[PDB]
Amino acid sequence: DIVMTQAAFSNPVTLGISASISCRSSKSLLHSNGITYLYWYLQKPGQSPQLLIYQMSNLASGVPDRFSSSGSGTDFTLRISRVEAEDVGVYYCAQNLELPWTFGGGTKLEIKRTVAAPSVFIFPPSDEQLKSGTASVVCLLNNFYPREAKVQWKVDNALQSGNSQESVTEQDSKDSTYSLSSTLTLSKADYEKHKVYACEVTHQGLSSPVTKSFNR
């Protein structure tokens, strides 16, 4: 019934330092019996949540000794010593001093690695898709950091205001990069009105915008 609050959406950190993720509760989690009913869970990309720490001071089985919980009463911190690339994921605090269990909104741990430019790849539509009356053009930005990137579609040098959408991977657990797709979809009739299809990419690691294009 207690409100659990994790003010930060994300916590960027460099490798090898101690990270700290904050959690606050609306009432003390300390029982008269001396136990603080605070828990920490981690949800790594693509996995279910997993228990890290239970009742403030106990490590779950299999969890490395680099995780510890500090604070008292209503203000707590999860500390991760010597952060590793594989630590990325969403960290949730939780309590069960009073039922129901309640959870913080999560804080995503992010590795600050060196800036890395995207490799930009472009895929024209398949004959199979065209035979069905639509054309999807896919621009791929592979293995870059930071996550922020601008992808613009230009058709015969005309900037496109719509008809595209993006998807971004979670930060990779091994190389700390992101990848991104931008997909432009047109009717086959509209696709065949134009010649040159191009995605123009802006990113911290590029000294100027990069365009990859093909001629239909």
Partner: protein
């Protein structure tokens, strides 16, 4: 250790009752406490309730009027029923074990989670299109190729490559709703350029809600 597996429909119509089942192996549900939690699309977690080793039940007061939990001890399964659902109930639903007592314990083992979407729309299976490798998708000795998995409903879809033999360099992007209200995603892989001459690349796509299952060979293009 203990293994928990959620099952049930991936799509439920609004106003209907949603029912899910958690199958437990490696432990008996006649000891401990057995929980349901859900994760909303924006990552907020909500505890729903538990059924105890004795069959007694606890429900989150915010949900008490809409939920029932049941069990079948012979099958070592327990179930969640959520009444009168709306799109506000769309979430990933988890079962999880609580080990311990009123004094000391934790929710330790969670299931893998199962997606449930609340909509009156009919299921739709994906079209699977090749993303063909070409010089437009290569950098030196590295080539990218993939599969576009387009116009399906609801989540989830699973994608593998060469029946799981190819995992290095694979990115399967999160599905994103299109302006049609249907999902689309690509799965891509980066491979040595030279391999394109003798290695075949096949994406395996499985969309269980619509009974669509497709293997698509991805050939080089000029």
């Amino acid at each position: 250790e203990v293994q928990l597996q959620e099952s049930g429909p991936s799509l439920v119509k609004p106003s209907q009752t949603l029912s899910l089942t958690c199958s437990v192996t490696g432990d008996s549900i006649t000891s401990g406490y057995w929980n349901w939690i859900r994760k909303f699309p924006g990552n907020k977690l909500e505890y729903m309730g538990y059924i105890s080793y004795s069959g007694s039940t606890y429900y989150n007061p915010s949900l008490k009027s809409r939920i029932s939990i049941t069990r079948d001890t012979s099958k070592n399964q327990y179930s969640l029923h959520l009444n009168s659902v709306t799109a506000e109930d769309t979430a990933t639903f988890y079962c999880a074990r609580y080990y311990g007592d009123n004094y000391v314990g934790a929710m330790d083992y969670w299931g893998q989670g199962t997606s449930v979407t609340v909509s009156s729309a009919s299921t739709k299976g994906p079209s699977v299109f090749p993303l063909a490798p070409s010089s437009k998708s290569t950098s030196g000795g590295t080539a990218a190729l993939g599969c576009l998995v387009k116009d399906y409903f609801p989540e989830p879809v699973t994608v593998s490559w060469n029946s799981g033999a190819l995992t290095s360099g694979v990115h399967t992007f999160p599905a994103v709703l299109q302006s049609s209200g249907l999902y689309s995603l690509s799965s891509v892989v980066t491979v040595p350029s030279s391999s394109l001459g003798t290695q075949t690349y096949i994406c395996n796509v499985n969309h269980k809600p619509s009974n669509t299952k497709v293997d698509k060979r991805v050939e080089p293009k000029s």
